[PDB]
Amino acid sequence: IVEGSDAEIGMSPWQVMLFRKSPQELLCGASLISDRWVLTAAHCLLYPPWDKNFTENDLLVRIGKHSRTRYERNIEKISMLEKIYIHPRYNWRENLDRDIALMKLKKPVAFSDYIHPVCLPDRETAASLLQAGYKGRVTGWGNLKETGQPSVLQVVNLPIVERPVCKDSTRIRITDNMFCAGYKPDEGKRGDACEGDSGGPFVMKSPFNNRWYQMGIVSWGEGCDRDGKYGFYTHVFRLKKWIQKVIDQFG
């Protein structure tokens, strides 16, 4: 996260770290959506241009964390993966369309002050909140700058951007399964996700019921925090029918 701040303890209790077993390293962010299911970006698990195709036994999920590098004894919980599910129409060849994946845990994780699931949006919450200018929150342990790494989880609040501005900021073909967020050059303020934040959540706090909803997944960008560029996020609601089908069929 560029131009963010340290998270408060328990501020993002759905935060998940995707962790490679060997070598032991951070791979991506992710989010907890139930006691057995974790949501992430497909490109965190499958990206053939970079020879990336992880299997379940390659990975661990670390939940309840604050420090990036410490083993947070008596606080974090480490879970093994039962199965990975990647969206069948995830477009890794072109533009990362439908950049979404689910991970089912081998055993349910115990909720605590530090571990708690985020809600997924209904159609009405999505329609009400996914408006240009409305702000969401992005969290992660990724790099602090494009060109270093944080001691603890970082947080930044960023406004959703009008779709024509998103489209005009890039040569990549944007789809309805993506949205973009960030400040414009004339707005003064700054902030973006960066390398290592991929797969983590873009959340919004509903003013109707005071619950946090995951509207986006950190998907892609061109650099980090560049003027005139915006971060792109998987549109969770538009892919929720697939999420539900997976959980109903395999949960």
Binding site: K21, Q24, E25, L60, T69, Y71, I78
Partner: peptide
């Protein structure tokens, strides 16, 4: 990164 308990790597 601090080493994690071996139980999670087995």
């Amino acid at each position: 990164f601090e080493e994690i308990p071996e139980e999670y790597l087995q």
